[PDB]
Amino acid sequence: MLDPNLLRTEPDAVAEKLARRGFKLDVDKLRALEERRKVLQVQTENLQAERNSRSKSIGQAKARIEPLRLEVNKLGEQLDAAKSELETLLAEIRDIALAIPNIPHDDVPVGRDENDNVEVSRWGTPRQFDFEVRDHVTLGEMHGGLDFAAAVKLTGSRFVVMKGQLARLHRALAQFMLDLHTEQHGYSENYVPYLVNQDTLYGTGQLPKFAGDLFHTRPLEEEADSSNYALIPTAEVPLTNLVRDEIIDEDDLPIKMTAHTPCFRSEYGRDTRGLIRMHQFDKVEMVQIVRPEDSMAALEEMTGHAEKVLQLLGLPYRKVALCTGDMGFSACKTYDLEVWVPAQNTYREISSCSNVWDFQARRMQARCRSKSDKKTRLVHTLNGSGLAVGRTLVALMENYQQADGRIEIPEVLRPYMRGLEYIG
Amino acid sequence: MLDPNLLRTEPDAVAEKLARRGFKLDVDKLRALEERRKVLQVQTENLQAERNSRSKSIGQAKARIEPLRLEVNKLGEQLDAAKSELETLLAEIRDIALAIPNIPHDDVPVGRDENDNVEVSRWGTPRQFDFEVRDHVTLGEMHGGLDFAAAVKLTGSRFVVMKGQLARLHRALAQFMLDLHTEQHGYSENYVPYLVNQDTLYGTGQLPKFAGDLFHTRPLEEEADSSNYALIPTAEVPLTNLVRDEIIDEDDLPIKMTAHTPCFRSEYGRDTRGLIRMHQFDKVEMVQIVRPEDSMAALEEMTGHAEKVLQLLGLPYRKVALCTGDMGFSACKTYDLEVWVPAQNTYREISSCSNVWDFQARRMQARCRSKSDKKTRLVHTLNGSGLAVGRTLVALMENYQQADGRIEIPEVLRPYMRGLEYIG
Numbered sequence: 001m002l003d004p005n006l007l008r009t010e011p012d013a014v015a016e017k018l019a020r021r022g023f024k025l026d027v028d029k030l031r032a033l034e035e036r037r038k039v040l041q042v043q044t045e046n047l048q049a050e051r052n053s054r055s056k057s058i059g060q061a062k063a064r065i066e067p068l069r070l071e072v073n074k075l076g077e078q079l080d081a082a083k084s085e086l087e088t089l090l091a092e093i094r095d096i097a098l099a100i101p102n103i104p105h106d107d108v109p110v111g112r113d114e115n116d117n118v119e120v121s122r123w124g125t126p127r128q129f130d131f132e133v134r135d136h137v138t139l140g141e142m143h144g145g146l147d148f149a150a151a152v153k154l155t156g157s158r159f160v161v162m163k164g165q166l167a168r169l170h171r172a173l174a175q176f177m178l179d180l181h182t183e184q185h186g187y188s189e190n191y192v193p194y195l196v197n198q199d200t201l202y203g204t205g206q207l208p209k210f211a212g213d214l215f216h217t218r219p220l221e222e223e224a225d226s227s228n229y230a231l232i233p234t235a236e237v238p239l240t241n242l243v244r245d246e247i248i249d250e251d252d253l254p255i256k257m258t259a260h261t262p263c264f265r266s267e268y269g270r271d272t273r274g275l276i277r278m279h280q281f282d283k284v285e286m287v288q289i290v291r292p293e294d295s296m297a298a299l300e301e302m303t304g305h306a307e308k309v310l311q312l313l314g315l316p317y318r319k320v321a322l323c324t325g326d327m328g329f330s331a332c333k334t335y336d337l338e339v340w341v342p343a344q345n346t347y348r349e350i351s352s353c354s355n356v357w358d359f360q361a362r363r364m365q366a367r368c369r370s371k372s373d374k375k376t377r378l379v380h381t382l383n384g385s386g387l388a389v390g391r392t393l394v395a396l397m398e399n400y401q402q403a404d405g406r407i408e409i410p411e412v413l414r415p416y417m418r419g420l421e422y423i424g
Numbered sequence: 425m426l427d428p429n430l431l432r433t434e435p436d437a438v439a440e441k442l443a444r445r446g447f448k449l450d451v452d453k454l455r456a457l458e459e460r461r462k463v464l465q466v467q468t469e470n471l472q473a474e475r476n477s478r479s480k481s482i483g484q485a486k487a488r489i490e491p492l493r494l495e496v497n498k499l500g501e502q503l504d505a506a507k508s509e510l511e512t513l514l515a516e517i518r519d520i521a522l523a524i525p526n527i528p529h530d531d532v533p534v535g536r537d538e539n540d541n542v543e544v545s546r547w548g549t550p551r552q553f554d555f556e557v558r559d560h561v562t563l564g565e566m567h568g569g570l571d572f573a574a575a576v577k578l579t580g581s582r583f584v585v586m587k588g589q590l591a592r593l594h595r596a597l598a599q600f601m602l603d604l605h606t607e608q609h610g611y612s613e614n615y616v617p618y619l620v621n622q623d624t625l626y627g628t629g630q631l632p633k634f635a636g637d638l639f640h641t642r643p644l645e646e647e648a649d650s651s652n653y654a655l656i657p658t659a660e661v662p663l664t665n666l667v668r669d670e671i672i673d674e675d676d677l678p679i680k681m682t683a684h685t686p687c688f689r690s691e692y693g694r695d696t697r698g699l700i701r702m703h704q705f706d707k708v709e710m711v712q713i714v715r716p717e718d719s720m721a722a723l724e725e726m727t728g729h730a731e732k733v734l735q736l737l738g739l740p741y742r743k744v745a746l747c748t749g750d751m752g753f754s755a756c757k758t759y760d761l762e763v764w765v766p767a768q769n770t771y772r773e774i775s776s777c778s779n780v781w782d783f784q785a786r787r788m789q790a791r792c793r794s795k796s797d798k799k800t801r802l803v804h805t806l807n808g809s810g811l812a813v814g815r816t817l818v819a820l821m822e823n824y825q826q827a828d829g830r831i832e833i834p835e836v837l838r839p840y841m842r843g844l845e846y847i848g
């Protein structure tokens with residue numbers, strides 16, 4: 001959510017910044033609804049005042065009454081109707097305001113799509129192979145460790161069953177990422193719900209615009225009106241909402257959180273084969289709750305935390321600053337890490353690191369204050385993959401493959417694999 | 425599913441064994457539907473034969489035809505109607521047969537409920553405290569590590585947010601269990617889908633009788649008729665279904681599988697406070713696919729594997745043989761492990777270990793064969809908690825608490841906690 005006062009005082013300037021994302025704000029419709037809202041607000045608050053007054057006239061008459069009793073019930077009918085009308089108009093203005101993406105930061109290059117994104121840095125040298133490169137799918141079949149057909153039988157398409165040593169390697173990856181961020185990077189570990197409510201989804205921006213990208217659960221019989229849940233598309237959703245309706249002491253900031261969770265999404269034709277696009281995938285998420293003036297330094301730090309995973313694993317990658325047209329809804333500034341994928345002869349996204357500014361903090365009412373201060377202010381929120389675990393397994397398998405199909409275990413993972421050097 | 429031939433040849437003996445579970449099989453209704461089914465089966469298969477014959481009369485006439493063309497379309501109408509009627513009757517017989525629980529094994533003591541269960545063994549001596557025992561909820565609040573209120577905000581009741589060192593301890597527990605079973609007990613590790621289809625749920629016995637105990641997901645827009653899924657209530661569901669529609673070589677048995685997953689259930693008034701009853705909980709599951717003659721020896725072995733977790737963690741427990749009236753739907757024989765819970769002054773279930781016999785194997789069409797053999801036979805299936813991770817955390821916190829609220833880390837977990845001796 002954008003600052004309502006910023007929409008009221010600078011709508012054409014807001015519209016101009018949003019135009020860079022390819023988003024067209026309907027200033028006229030929004031203005032026409034807001035002008036009508038002010039008329040109905042006055043009518044309603046006048047009705048509220050007259051009802052409260054005639055109610056008080058009854059209280060002093062019933063102590064010192066049917067003609068006044070009928071008048072208060074007639075006024076009560078009219079006010080309830082007036083409030084219902086105003087609330088429908090408020091919901092309509094809300095539907096527009098909550099579908100507005102975040103204003104891009106001035107650091108963000110202007111562009112229409114992913115082809116306009118700018119490479120910032122590059123690390124490592126993609127390996128030169130002495131044999132024909134096998135993809136992770138072929139390697140998974142050779143070890144009998146990645147079974148797509150069994151997952152179609154159990155569930156359907158875009159699911160996988162991992163078996164044996166490759167399942168153990170996938171686990172070792174998540175353990176290594178969690179230990180790195182909690183031991184070296186200052187993140188606190190968390191176990192979170194994998195099902196969340198509507199308030200949580202509005203808070204981080206999945207609602208109202210991206211309901212179709214979620215798996216929704218039908219309400220429970222014994223919880224009929226309180227269990228309309230959705231599976232989390234990322235640990236960012238429950239972790240960021242931990243500060244919803246909180247006033248944090250500024251001395252307690254930054255709040256750095258990490259979690260390892262399955263991620264459920266329903267986004268065809270693109271990446272039909274393998275682990276790249278899945279309905280369920282594991283991801284080690286990093287979330288930072290910071291002071292408004294520290295968010296840009298925190299973005300650089302958190303991106304470096306995700307880069308450290310790829311460097312210790314010895315996986316060559318490139319760092320890309322996303323353009324205005326390729327950014328996600330909540331982001332004001334994003335860096336993507338793209339890992340070398342040998343069988344695809346290109347770099348593929350493995351992490352997305354964002355500064356959300358006060359966008360989710362406004363929706364959530366997540367505030368901070370210095371003990372002295374007469375008023376609070378909204379915090380800033382940041383989130384980044386450190387990393388997507390299935391895509392790391394793809395990168396690891398393809399980059400560490402041996403001529404016979406054996407997978408060399410990266411040195412940093414060997415302590416997590418009981419010192420094992422090769423799979424197979 | 426029970427053997428259909430066993431219901432046809434010994435219905436009163438089947439009914440008598442089921443009576444011990446408190447289940448009343450309607451032999452009369454089942455017999456009346458089956459007698460009618462045989463009448464409709466003859467009528468239909470006669471219509472099939474006459475349609476196939478008159479179709480063949482057209483093929484030889486169109487080479488050597490309207491009076492015969494009208495006759496085949498009239499017969500086609502009648503057969504489609506006859507098949508539709510028969511299929512409705514088959515579905516009705518199926519609804520009864522698929523709601524029949526498993527026949528108890530003769531080893532199982534006869535009883536009505538949990539008060540008729542028999543203690544087999546006991547291990548360890550419950551600790552005597554020099555202070556008032558705090559429950560895990562109070563201990564969680566003291567460390568700031570178990571937050572129920574934040575989970576209500578994120579989702580609703582029967583969810584938890586674990587923060588910091590207690591979240592790390594919960595993870596260390598699951599890592600220790602997985603390593604024990606894969607390194608010492610001969611189980612192969614697996615990554616499974618946490619959403620499953622209707623076939624999978626029928627296969628392990630959740631369907632048709634326990635749909636209300638599940639969280640169901642609404643179908644996806646782009647997968648309208650193939651995505652009616654439910655969240656898994658246990659890793660037993662996807663793991664056991666891995667052998668659905670398979671013919672296994674008997675030399676490849678036993679197939680021993682393990683997985684660590686969240687478990688989603690919707691079962692009020694009982695265990696309102698804490699981690700004992702939750703909508704989401706982690707569990708390390710053990711599944712065995714064995715030869716029919718090895719299932720009873722496998723039950724003893726798998727129960728010992730779950731006991732080994734509690735012994736290495738130094739958690740006193742009791743082993744209980746469940747009576748006929750306290751067994752779960754699929755089980756023919758079950759042992760429950762009940763861990764000492766200091767704040768409750770009793771033993772509480774932490775594991776349920778079952779021999780399912782050929783019940784799920786029949787539903788799934790999971791078979792085995794010796795290379796010589798002219799026919800196959802159904803395998804046996806077994807499943808057991810090694811263990812429920814949230815309930816292990818309860819047991820660990822309460823049994824290892826210090827006077828000031830500090831949690832002593834059990835010796836076997838110290839390598840999984842970087843050598844840390846105490847939380848706090």
Ligand SMILES: Cn1c(=O)ccn([C@@H]2O[C@H](COS(=O)(=O)NC(=O)[C@@H](N)CO)[C@@H](O)[C@H]2O)c1=O
Binds near residue numbers: 275285353389
């Ligand atoms: C398997 N798979 C997918 O199917 C889709 C995405 N990803 C990876 O997830 C990373 C993070 O996704 S995101 O870009 O939408 N950003 C977030 O979720 C934020 N909370 C930051 O993590 C992508 O970069 C993909 O690599 C999959 O792995």
Ligand SMILES: Cn1c(=O)ccn([C@@H]2O[C@H](COS(=O)(=O)NC(=O)[C@@H](N)CO)[C@@H](O)[C@H]2O)c1=O
Binds near residue numbers: 775776812814
């Ligand atoms: C948190 N919580 C619950 O809310 C309910 C049960 N449990 C534990 O789960 C164990 C296994 O559940 S079961 O008895 O239904 N059996 C199975 O699911 C089989 N697949 C074997 O694991 C119980 O023994 C409870 O300890 C919870 O922890």
Ligand SMILES: [Ca+2]
Binds near residue numbers: 252
């Ligand atoms: Ca501080």
Ligand SMILES: [Ca+2]
Binds near residue numbers: 326327328336352
């Ligand atoms: Ca992106």
Ligand SMILES: [Ca+2]
Binds near residue numbers: 328330331354356383
């Ligand atoms: Ca975001």
Ligand SMILES: [Ca+2]
Binds near residue numbers: 675676677
């Ligand atoms: Ca063998």
Ligand SMILES: [Ca+2]
Binds near residue numbers: 760
């Ligand atoms: Ca039980």
Ligand SMILES: [Ca+2]
Binds near residue numbers: 754755778780807
């Ligand atoms: Ca069972």
